[PDB]
């Protein structure tokens, strides 16, 4: 009447993505961990743009839209800052936000390429992905135009908007050989073999298994550049644990109140 | 804009991609729909039945 | 509902069926009135339905294919009369618009 002891094994650890395997766990836990990877991951991003003079050809809102999608590294800052909604002050305080500034004006004859490098941040560690590969092109200016503005960044998660979606794409896959028959191939010979498939090239799919549970769930969390993949996994698990704890506390209070 | 290079068109707040061929009346793009009709100077022999004539040589 | 189990000998005398069908043919009325024209019109209108009721409810078929019991047959008569009463055309219904 208790849970299980899952095991973890990393197959490839890089600075762009991680391929780990979780064994001895239920499918629901795996799928929830995936959906938390995509939606419920704290991360800093641009959410408040004050435009003072925009003489470019694009719309006034286009600049803000593009600035909202520029990733910001938050390896050790997202855990420190607090949600702006729960702040106990007025104006975007640096304790709960990060300020940005952009002032570019094409003076020379050639056209300018306003990139993310022009975003001069007040904080040293909260900068766009340019540390260590070209930079995210914001807009193109021509002689006579200008773009002056300043924006503030805050913490959010993908459930609110896609700007806070650190993972590019999670490759979730379990049971490479169709052993549990969760999908029925009309013509198994016509399908290619999964990357993680242990069967030989002769047989098309593994035989049926009545008493068999889904295990050995594969992951390919791919970081966009803001948060490290293992950092994404740790943050997501910590957030799920916090949500579970809050739910338990609320349930306990409701029971005692009755 | 008769045979004018794209440079001037861009400088005159216009594009080289605009097909043209449309009048501008009171700041509104007006186009003349090509009407079709029956070809002139040609003899037509119809057979209208809802009348007193068996055949009719319209021209 | 009554669990007839059409294998065992049922307890339903034919006279019960006959008298029940006759009483039901009396209960279902369309042209109210004892007047001979009224009775003639009532017989003419509710003619096909009575013929079908007699054809389905017999002394032989009820004892060979249906095997209903007395309680089952009484419930059947009640259900038939209630459904026919509900099936009557409600006065004040715009049948011209419905037909159009």
């Amino acid at each position: 009447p208790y849970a299980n002891q899952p095991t973890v094994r990393i197959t490839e650890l890089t600075d762009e993505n991680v391929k780990f395997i979780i064994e001895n766990t239920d499918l629901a836990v795996a799928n929830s961990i995936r959906r938390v990877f995509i939606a419920e991951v704290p991360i800093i991003a641009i959410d408040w743009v004050q435009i003072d003079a925009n003489s470019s050809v694009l719309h006034d809102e286009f600049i803000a839209h593009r600035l909202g999608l520029i990733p910001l590294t938050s390896d050790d800052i997202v855990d420190k800052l607090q949600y702006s909604r729960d702040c106990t002050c007025e104006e975007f305080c640096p304790e709960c936000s990060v300020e940005f500034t952009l002032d570019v004006r094409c003076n020379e004859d050639q056209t300018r390429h306003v990139t993310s490098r022009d975003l001069i941040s007040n904080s040293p560690r909260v900068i766009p992905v340019t540390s260590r590969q070209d930079d995210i092109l914001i807009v193109k200016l021509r002689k006579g135009q200008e773009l002056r503005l300043r924006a503030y960044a805050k913490k959010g998660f993908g459930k609110e908007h896609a700007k806070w979606n650190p993972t590019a794409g999670v490759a979730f896959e379990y049971d490479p050989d169709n052993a549990l028959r969760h999908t029925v191939y009309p013509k198994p010979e016509e399908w290619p073999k999964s990357e993680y498939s242990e069967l030989d090239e002769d047989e098309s799919q593994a035989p049926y298994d009545p008493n068999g549970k889904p295990e050995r769930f594969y992951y390919n969390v791919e970081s966009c550049g803001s948060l490290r993949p293992e950092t994404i996994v740790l943050s997501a698990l910590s957030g799920l644990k916090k949500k579970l704890s809050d739910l338990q506390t609320q349930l306990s209070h409701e029971i005692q109140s009755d | 804009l008769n045979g004018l290079t794209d440079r001037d068109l861009c400088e005159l707040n216009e594009c080289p991609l605009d097909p043209g061929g449309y009048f501008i009346i009171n700041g509104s793009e007006k186009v003349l729909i090509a009407q079709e009709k029956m070809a002139t100077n040609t003899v037509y022999v119809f057979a209208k039945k809802d009348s007193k004539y068996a055949y009719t040589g319209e021209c | 509902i009554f669990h007839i189990n059409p294998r065992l000998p049922s307890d339903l005398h034919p006279i019960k069926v006959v008298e029940g069908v006759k009483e039901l043919s009396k209960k279902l009325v369309i042209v109210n009135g004892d007047d001979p024209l009224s009775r003639q019109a009532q017989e003419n209108a509710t003619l096909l339905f009575n013929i079908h009721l007699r054809s389905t409810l017999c002394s032989r078929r009820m004892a060979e294919e249906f095997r209903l019991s007395g309680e089952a047959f009484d419930w059947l008569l009640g259900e038939i009369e209630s459904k026919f009463n509900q099936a009557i055309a409600h006065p004040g219904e715009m049948v011209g618009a419905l037909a159009a």
Partner: protein, 115 residues
């Protein structure tokens, strides 16, 4: 014009309870747990964890309407085991399993770097 904001999916509104218990009348020892401002993330894991417990006769959630943020979880256990303690045990041991998974993943990462 009337598209709802983005914060109404997770943030509680003033007066709205995070969890409400409601006993069912059709069968004994059956309560419906109604959760507010949540999705399948917080209901599917609890459903499966309840399914693991043999004393839980019934376990399953639903979403009354996808646009509306609410889930109802119905739990029915044996008469000698209330569903409140079943829910509490499921949450507690799921938390323990998640913490252990965290610790194992972390040690695996720290060993993978130069090792």
């Amino acid at each position: 014009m009337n598209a709802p904001p983005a914060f109404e999916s997770f943030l509680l509104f003033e007066g709205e309870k995070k969890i409400t218990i409601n006993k069912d009348t059709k069968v004994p020892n059956a309560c419906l747990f109604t959760i507010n401002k949540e999705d399948h993330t917080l209901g599917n894991i609890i459903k499966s964890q309840l399914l693991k417990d043999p004393q839980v006769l019934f376990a399953g959630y639903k979403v009354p309407h996808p646009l509306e943020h609410k889930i109802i979880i119905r739990v029915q256990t044996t008469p000698d085991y209330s569903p409140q303690e079943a829910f509490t045990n499921a949450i507690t041991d799921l938390i323990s399993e998640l913490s252990l998974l965290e610790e194992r993943f972390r040690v695996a990462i720290k060993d993978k770097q130069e090792g």
